[PDB]
Structures are given as structure tokens and as C-alpha cells.
Design an enzyme around this catalytic site. Structure first.
Site, PDB file in Angstrom:
ATOM      1  N   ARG A  67      -8.504  -4.937   7.391  1.00 40.45           N
ATOM      2  CA  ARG A  67      -8.558  -6.071   8.306  1.00 40.45           C
ATOM      3  C   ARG A  67      -8.838  -7.342   7.519  1.00 40.45           C
ATOM      4  NH1 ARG A  67     -14.426  -4.865  11.296  1.00 40.45           N
ATOM      5  NH2 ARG A  67     -14.987  -3.067   9.979  1.00 40.45           N
ATOM      6  N   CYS A 122      -7.104   4.097   0.927  1.00 41.61           N
ATOM      7  CA  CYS A 122      -6.639   4.847   2.087  1.00 41.61           C
ATOM      8  C   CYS A 122      -5.704   4.028   2.966  1.00 41.61           C
ATOM      9  CB  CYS A 122      -7.827   5.358   2.909  1.00 41.61           C
ATOM     10  SG  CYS A 122      -8.702   4.106   3.879  1.00 41.61           S
ATOM     11  N   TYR A 123      -5.791   2.697   2.916  1.00 38.93           N
ATOM     12  CA  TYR A 123      -4.895   1.851   3.695  1.00 38.93           C
ATOM     13  C   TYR A 123      -3.513   1.721   3.072  1.00 38.93           C
ATOM     14  CZ  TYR A 123      -9.212   0.583   6.051  1.00 38.93           C
ATOM     15  OH  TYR A 123     -10.404   0.620   6.739  1.00 38.93           O
TER      16      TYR A 123
END
Ligand SMILES: CCCC[C@H]1CN(c2cccc(Cl)c2)C(=O)CN1Cc1cncn1Cc1ccc(Br)cc1
Ligand SMILES: CC(C)=CCC/C(C)=C\CC/C(C)=C\COP(=O)(O)OP(=O)(O)O
Ligand SMILES: O=S(=O)(O)C[C@H](O)CNC1CCCCC1
Ligand SMILES: O=S(=O)(O)C[C@H](O)CNC1CCCCC1
Ligand SMILES: O=S(=O)(O)C[C@H](O)CNC1CCCCC1
Ligand SMILES: [Zn+2]
Lengths: 485, 318
Positions: free
Chosen positions: A304, A312-313
Site C-alpha cells: 500500500r 510477497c507482493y
């Protein structure tokens, strides 16, 4: 293919400007910039022809990652108790990472994996996070168990797929008990309501041929209203009293943006009138690409705005980019090519920053300074696959799937819980089966679009967007439950 | 030392039930004696469907060892409603659970189910606790989502007064003062000011909001949160971009706020999102060549990490 994907070693690394305005966000951002940039300075450029003397070598340490995952087939220390309700996820993170790494399990271990998951299947419907005599069914372990059975199971009497086919009615009844009038789902009895549950449910419902009009009512509206002003999606939307309006309940986040894009994409396959409700695809693509970090932070993705990059994103945000890209393509076509994110920098983040230090435990991690775990191992590798292989949803492939689909073959139609909850007739139900099956098998790896940073020994297998299992697992699995051959 | 539950008179009547995942399961976890013993007797309690005080104590012991055990949380909430227990006392226990760092999706959802069933006439005390609980983590996603639900749920019942909305914006304004890069507080402001159904949409409110956005940009010109809030604001209300351009152009290298006479220190130019504003402003003026030139510079010079994306935007204009 690297014209618009510059390496982070070829770009100037400069910190985020302060504007003479210190804050806690900037303190942590500057600290992680130093941590990531130091490791890159210690690591030889993976795009180099001869590895530099004195630097660390960034090649994918696949054998170390294989041994890191190996402990899952023996025992896990006591600190794993915090995951005692997420054991199907420990299985999926393991068997899917091994699939990506190219390591096969022998049949005896696959049989153990299948048998263990079947002990998690409840006769009343759905999988729990553990043995059915100890834990109640839950939408998230149900997804992880179904996907793990797709990876480790087969069509024999001991393969587990037969038991899944026999449980289709109960699983469907469990899905309906989870459903709310506004289109949301509780993840379990008395559980929370967010788009993780919608995503997990829609995947399993798509794979097992248990999608009905009553199951999908308002589901598109719940998901569409999760989109925030930033372009991404929040965890849930709130229905104000059928409802007069729906409002998103939090920030756009990479995890919930992934589930929302994947859910909406799955819903576009359903042939219902004026369904699914539209989303802002352009804004979702814009938000996705904006979350890829600067060269000083290795080009990884953050979850974000004004938060930190996290390996992990690479799957959550990076793996959503092909879906958002396809939705943008459909909208531009409906009113009438370079990569959309830095495919090279993302691989460099995986190879340089996300891998555990060599000669240690192996595995992949969130950031330098963080212990590796099975969750970050699976999602780093899933995102790396997306970066290495150009994925797109091919309309011609989908058209070819429609031409070969056999509507006369299939498992028994599920009995809806409400009298008028099913499809109107066989023509409409078979048309729905064909579209959902054909579009589920519509993802392809574009020939010539492969980009393997560091050499072909870094190549891993191709994962499928939306589903996140190998296409070679997805095809025979969904063909089994749709009786296609 | 540890006293097994089979050596306790209060449990002599209960025959424990063992965990059944087969003779040789994958991903086994090496449980402590205390955790295995509690789950053994919990399997029996749930089997006989016992709703009791000892079952209540047993659920608390289990969730202290594993706060993520959603099955035990479901049984615990079923215990509280069946036995008509004090849901206010349970909130005091949940306060200790956050103190001792026992947290998960399940603990936050348990607190929501409590507030829902209590259904207090005024949830001001819970709103205040949520504000204070953001001290260790000002960006906790579960907390911000819970705050959204609390205001949305109890405003549906008509229990959020105008004074409560007003002090909530005061608190949100203070959060952005302490850290203007808190994108969660920006999202909360969007709920208070734009998205919530009771929000005011007048000419003064649009001017007031636009003043707060431009001032926030001029304070932190590289704050992505302020730039995204600006683009969402204009898009949501169909406001044109050209009139505001005089306040944006100094960042690309009239009665609305403006940048400082020299820009603040450590403000390198140009600001990439300011260029995106200029390019979209060119598109608003139907000037595609000028927009394509800005995208080209973003792709090749000023935002090269997104070189492929800005090139895709450049090709759309041509
Ligand atoms: C092996 C330990 C990894 C912890 C992760 C994963 N995990 C989880 C547990 C069970 C099932 C599933 Cl599927 C996921 C979490 O609870 C917390 N996580 C911490 C995290 C890391 N990097 C980002 N996060 C934030 C985030 C929060 C919620 C979810 Br759900 C996923 C990620
Ligand atoms: C299908 C499925 C299980 C999807 C999972 C959803 C997901 C990946 C993440 C949700 C993350 C969350 C609620 C908060 C972020 O935690 P954080 O603050 O620790 O991380 P952050 O700072 O990077 O946002
Ligand atoms: O890094 S990995 O690819 O995962 C595997 C490690 O390199 C193992 N290196 C061995 C050291 C001793 C001689 C044989 C090789
Ligand atoms: O036969 S079914 O009803 O489908 C499944 C049984 O009820 C077992 N349920 C568990 C009992 C112990 C606590 C967690 C749930
Ligand atoms: O196949 S190519 O991309 O042209 C080049 C090879 O893959 C390079 N792999 C290395 C070989 C020596 C040991 C470490 C890995
Ligand atoms: Zn992570």
C-alpha cells in the site's frame, strides 16, 4: 524485450526526498532503503557475463529452497502453533513452490499429502485448517486444500479427486451458508467478511463446477464497491440499507486488490445479464504499477501507499498486473506492446534481496533482516514466475476451448437451496459451464516474451494468473470435474 | 510443574478425544504438552456440545496459546451468548489481549461481534479505545477497517451524532499532522469527507477540501498519498484539472494555495506525479502531442521504473 525494463543497477539509486518534513513513515522508509541498497552493493549484477570477484552471486539457490521446504514432510517446531489453523496453507505453500522449482514428489509422499487433506474435509461441507474432528470448515483452507489436491492428487481411487467430486453438493451447501444478502461471504461460521473469502470461494466454485445464479447474486456488487479512490481495492464494502449504496472500508491493499481483480475476472466468465458490475480497470492498473518501488529499494512491490516493499507482493501486486491489463484491454476494445511493470527489476529484487543468505537455511523472505518462511517462499516464487513469463488471456485460445467443449459430459448438477436458485434450463446451464471452463483455461504464456534475468538456470515454471497453480496442474484438474478429455 | 487435566477433579468426568489426521500426516506441528492437553479436552467438550464455565475457561487458555484458532473463537462466542455472560467483561479481557500482544483476524472479529451484540446506545467509548490502540501501530489495517465498520454500522442505526462526526475529523486531522504520509488516515478522511452517506456536498465543502489537499501537497510535495487523494477527488466530483494547474506547475520543472517562494529544501524537481497531472491536463485540453511528450519524458528520464507503463500511456495518445 528489456527496452522498457531497465535493471536497477543501470539506474541511479537516490532516497525518497524528505521535503524537510521528518515523520515516522520516512524514518522506516530511509532505514529499509539503506538495508536493501547495501545488499545490492554487496551483490554482483545478475546481468553480468562474468560474476564479479568479491561480490555475492545472485543465482537462484533452488536446492537450498528445496531443503528449506523439506522440513514440512517430517516435523515443524513448536513455534508453528500459530499456524495450527492454517495447515492446508503450509501444504499449498510447499507443494506449489516445489512445482515452481521443478522438484517432483514421489507417489508415496503425494498419497500422504492427499490423505492428510482428506482428514481435513468435513462431511457437512468444506475444508478446515486441520482435522475435521478439531476444526470447522473455512473458505481459506478450502481453497488451499483444493489447490493442493490439484498439485498432488490424481484420478485414481486413492487420488483424492474422486472424494472432491463426491463432496460437490456439501461444499456448495457450505458456500451458500456463508453467503450474505449483500453479496459478501463469511469465511466460516461466525467469521469475518472480506474479498479473500470471495476469491477463495469463486476459485473453488469455478474448478469444481458448482456455480449457480443464487451463489453469485450481488457478489459482483460487493467486490466492485471495494475499489477505493486510489484505484486498488480494500478488504470489504459496507451495505447501507437492496442496499442504497456501498462504501469501501479501508485502504487499497495489494492482497485485497489481488483477490478483487481475480474475483471480478472470474465473474466476467459467467453469462448472466448485465453481470458482473463494472470496475475501474484503468485506475486499478495505475495503482498496480505505482506500487513497484524505486531502484534504491530493489524494484520490489509494496502492499500500500507509503508502506514498505515486500517480496510477497511480487505475487499479490505483480500477479494482478496481467489481470488488470486484460481488463483494460477489454475496455479499450469495447469502445472501439511494452511490459506494464518492470519485469527485470522484480526478478532482481527476488534474486538479490528476497533470497535467504547463501549457505544458511534457504528459503525466501519479506526483506533483508527478516527470517524466511513458507509463505514468502511461495509468493516470491509465484511473483518471479509472473515476471519471467509474459502471461495474457488469449481470446483465440478461449474461442478454441469453446469449440472443443463437450456439454453432454459432466458431473450431476448441484441442487440449489432455494427453488428458483439454479439455472433456468439446460441450454443456459451448459452455456455457463462452457464459458466458465473455456475462460478458466484461457491464460497462455506468450511465445518470445520470456525474460530470465541472470541466465536460464534461474528459470522457474509458469504459474497461472488468477488461480496460481501450474497450467499443467490446472488443465487435468478442471477437466476431471467437467468430464472433459 | 504442570498438572495434567486428567489429574484434576474438575475434569474427571471428561474422556479426552485425540486429534485425528491419520497415522502419518504431512506438516505436523510439535505441540507442547499444555497445548495438546487443552485441545484434547476441547475436542471432547465440542463433541458433547457442552456450554459451561469450564468450557469458557478452556477456550481462553487455548486462544492465549494460539490467538488464530478460529474454531475455538467461534465456540467461545457461542459460549458467551448461551450462558448470557457479561459482554462488557469480555471487552475488558480483549483489552488485555491487545496489551499482551495476542492479536489476529479472529481477535478483531471477536471484538466486532461483541460491539454488534452489545449494540450500545453510544459507542463513543469504543471509538476512543480504537484511537488509543493505534499508538504502537498507526497503520494497523485491521484497526482502520474496524473503525470504518464501527462508524458505518452505528450510523445505520442513527447513533452517530453531528458532534461525533466533527470530533472524528478533528482526530483525523491531528493524525495527518503527526505523519502526513499515513495513507490510512488519508483513507479515513475520504470516508469522513466524501464517501460516507451523510457527508455534505456543497460549494464550500469542495473548496475547503481542495484547500486542505493543496496545502498538504505544498507541505510534502513528494507525498504520494496527497497526490492520489487529489486525483481521486477531482475524478470523483468531475472537477477539471486545468484551473488548479497554477499550483502544480512549479513542481514540473487564482484563489487556491500556492507553493513557497523557494520550494522547501530536499525537494528535487520535477515531481513525477506532478508531470502525470500535467499530462492529464494536456489530455483535458485535447492536446495529445503535448501529453505524449510528457509521458515520453516520464518513461525515459523522470520515472524510469515505470518506463513500460508511461510508454503505454504515450502510445495511447498517438
Ligand atoms: C508463515 C508466516 C507468514 C505471516 C503472513 C502470512 N499470514 C497467513 C496466515 C495464514 C494463512 C494465510 Cl493465506 C496467510 C499472516 O497471517 C501474516 N502474514 C504476515 C505478512 C507477511 N507479509 C505480509 N504479511 C501481511 C499478511 C496478513 C494477512 C494475510 Br491472510 C497475508 C499477509
Ligand atoms: C487469498 C489471500 C489469503 C489473500 C491474503 C490477503 C493479503 C495478502 C494481505 C492482507 C494484509 C492485511 C490485512 C494487512 C497488511 O498487514 P501488514 O501491515 O503487516 O503488511 P503491509 O505493511 O505490507 O501492508
Ligand atoms: O545454492 S544451491 O543451488 O541451492 C546448492 C548449493 O550451492 C550446494 N553447493 C554444493 C557445495 C559442495 C559441492 C557441491 C555443491
Ligand atoms: O460430521 S460433521 O458434523 O460434518 C463434523 C463433526 O461435527 C466434527 N466437528 C468438529 C467437532 C469438534 C470441534 C470442531 C468441529
Ligand atoms: O543458459 S545460459 O542463460 O545462456 C547461461 C547459464 O544458464 C548460466 N548458469 C550458470 C552456469 C554456471 C553455474 C552457475 C549458473
Ligand atoms: Zn510479505
Amino acid at each position: 524485450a528489456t527496452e522498457f525494463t531497465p535493471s536497477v543497477y543501470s539506474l541511479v539509486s537516490k532516497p525518497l526526498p524528505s521535503n524537510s518534513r521528518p515523520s515516522a513513515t520516512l524514518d522506516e522508509q530511509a532505514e529499509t532503503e539503506d538495508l536493501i541498497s547495501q545488499l545490492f552493493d554487496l551483490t554482483a549484477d545478475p546481468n553480468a557475463l562474468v560474476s564479479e570477484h568479491g561480490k555475492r552471486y545472485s543465482g537462484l539457490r533452488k536446492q537450498e529452497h528445496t531443503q528449506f521446504l523439506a522440513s514440512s514432510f517430517f516435523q515443524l517446531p513448536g513455534k508453528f502453533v500459530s499456524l495450527d489453523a492454517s495447515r492446508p496453507w503450509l501444504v499449498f505453500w510447499t507443494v506449489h513452490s516445489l512445482d515452481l522449482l521443478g522438484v517432483a514428489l514421489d507417489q508415496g509422499t503425494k498419497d500422504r499429502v492427499v490423505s492428510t487433506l482428506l482428514h481435513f474435509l468435513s462431511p457437512k461441507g468444506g475444508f478446515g485448517g486441520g482435522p475435521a474432528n478439531s476444526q470447522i470448515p473455512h473458505l481459506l483452507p478450502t481453497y488451499a486444500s483444493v489447490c493442493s489436491l490439484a498439485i498432488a492428487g490424481n484420478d485414481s481411487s486413492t487420488g483424492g479427486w474422486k472424494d472432491l467430486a463426491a463432496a460437490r453438493q456439501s461444499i456448495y451447501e457450505f458456500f451458500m451458508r456463508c453467503k450474505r444478502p449483500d453479496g459478501g461471504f463469511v469465511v466460516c461460521e461466525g467469521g469475518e467478511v472480506d474479498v479473500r473469502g470471495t476469491y477463495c470461494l469463486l476459485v473453488v466454485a469455478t474448478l469444481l463446477d458448482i456455480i449457480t445464479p443464487e451463489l453469485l447474486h450481488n457478489v459482483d456488487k460487493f467486490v466492485s464497491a471495494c475499489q477505493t479512490y486510489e484505484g486498488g481495492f480494500a478488504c470489504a464494502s459496507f451495505p447501507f440499507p437492496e442496499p442504497s449504496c456501498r462504501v469501501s472500508m479501508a485502504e487499497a491493499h495489494g492482497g485485497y486488490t489481488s483477490c478483487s481483480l481475480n474475483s471480478h475476472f472470474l465473474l466476467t466468465s459467467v453469462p448472466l445479464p448485465s453481470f458482473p458490475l463494472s470496475i475501474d480497470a484503468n485506475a486499478a492498473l495505475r495503482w498496480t504499477v505505482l506500487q513497484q518501488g524505486e531502484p534504491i529499494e530493489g524494484g520490489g512491490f509494496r502492499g500500500r501507499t507509503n508502506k514498505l516493499v515486500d517480496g510477497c507482493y511480487s505475487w499479490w501486486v505483480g500477479g494482478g498486473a496481467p489481470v488488470a491489463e486484460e481488463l483494460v484491454r477489454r475496455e479499450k476494445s469495447r469502445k472501439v506492446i511494452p511490459p506494464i511493470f518492470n519485469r527485470v527489476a522484480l526478478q532482481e529484487f527476488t534474486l538479490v534481496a528476497a533470497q535467504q543468505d547463501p549457505g544458511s537455511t534457504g528459503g525466501l523472505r519479506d526483506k533483508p533482516g527478516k527470517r524466511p518462511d513458507q509463505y514468502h517462499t511461495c509468493n516470491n516464487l509465484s511473483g518471479l514466475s509472473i515476471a519471467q513469463h509474459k502471461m495474457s488471456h488469449s481470446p483465440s485460445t478461449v474461442s478454441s476451448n469453446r469449440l472443443k467443449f463437450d456439454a453432454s459430459k459432466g458431473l450431476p448438477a448441484v441442487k440449489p437451496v432455494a427453488p428458483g436458485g439454479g439455472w433456468k434450463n439446460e441450454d443456459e446451464r451448459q452455456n455457463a459451464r462452457r464459458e466458465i471452463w473455456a475462460n478458466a483455461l484461457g491464460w497462455i504464456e506468450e511465445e518470445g516474451g520470456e525474460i530470465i534475468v541472470g541466465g536460464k538456470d534461474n528459470r522457474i515454471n509458469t504459474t497461472t494468473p488468477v488461480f496460481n497453480i501450474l497450467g499443467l496442474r490446472l488443465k487435468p484438474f478442471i477437466n476431471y470435474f467437467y468430464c472433459q478429455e | 510443574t504442570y498438572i495434567p487435566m486428567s489429574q484434576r477433579r474438575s475434569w474427571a468426568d471428561v474422556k479426552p478425544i485425540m486429534q485425528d489426521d491419520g497415522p502419518n500426516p504431512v506438516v505436523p506441528i510439535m505441540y507442547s504438552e499444555e497445548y495438546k492437553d487443552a485441545m484434547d479436552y476441547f475436542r471432547a467438550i465440542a463433541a458433547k456440545e457442552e456450554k459451561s464455565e469450564r468450557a469458557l475457561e478452556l477456550t481462553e487458555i487455548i486462544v492465549r496459546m494460539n490467538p488464530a484458532h478460529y474454531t475455538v473463537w467461534q465456540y467461545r462466542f457461542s459460549l458467551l451468548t448461551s450462558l448470557n455472560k457479561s459482554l462488557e467483561d469480555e471487552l475488558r479481557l480483549m483489552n488485555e489481549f491487545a496489551v499482551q500482544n495476542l492479536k489476529s483476524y479472529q481477535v478483531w472479529h471477536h471484538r466486532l461481534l461483541l460491539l454488534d451484540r452489545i449494540s450500545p446506545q453510544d459507542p463513543v467509548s469504543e471509538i476512543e479505545y480504537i484511537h488509543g490502540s493505534l499508538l504502537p501501530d498507526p497503520k494497523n489495517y485491521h484497526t482502520w477497517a474496524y473503525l470504518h465498520w464501527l462508524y458505518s454500522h452505528f450510523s445505520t442505526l442513527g447513533r452517530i451524532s453531528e458532534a461525533q462526526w466533527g470530533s472524528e475529523l478533528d482526530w483525523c486531522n491531528e493524525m495527518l499532522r503527526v505523519d502526513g504520509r499515513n495513507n490510512s488516515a488519508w483513507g479515513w478522511r475520504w470516508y469522513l469527507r466524501v464517501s460516507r452517506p451523510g457527508a455534505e456536498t456543497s460549494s464550500r465543502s469542495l473548496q475547503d477540501e481542495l484547500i486542505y489537499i493543496l496545502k498538504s501537497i505544498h507541505l510534502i510535495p513528494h507525498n504520494v498519498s496527497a497526490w492520489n487523494y487529489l486525483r481521486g477527488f477531482l475524478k470523483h466530483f468531475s472537477l477539471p484539472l486545468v484551473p488548479i494547474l497554477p499550483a502544480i506547475l512549479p513542481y514540473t520543472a487564482f484563489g487556491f494555495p500556492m507553493p513557497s517562494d523557494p520550494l522547501p529544501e530536499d525537494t528535487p524537481l520535477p515531481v513525477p506525479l506532478a508531470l502525470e497531472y500535467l499530462a492529464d491536463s494536456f489530455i483535458e485540453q485535447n492536446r495529445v502531442d503535448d501529453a505524449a511528450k510528457v509521458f515520453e519524458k516520464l518513461s525515459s528520464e523522470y520515472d524510469q521504473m515505470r518506463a513500460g507503463y508511461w510508454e503505454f500511456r504515450r502510445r495511447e495518445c498517438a
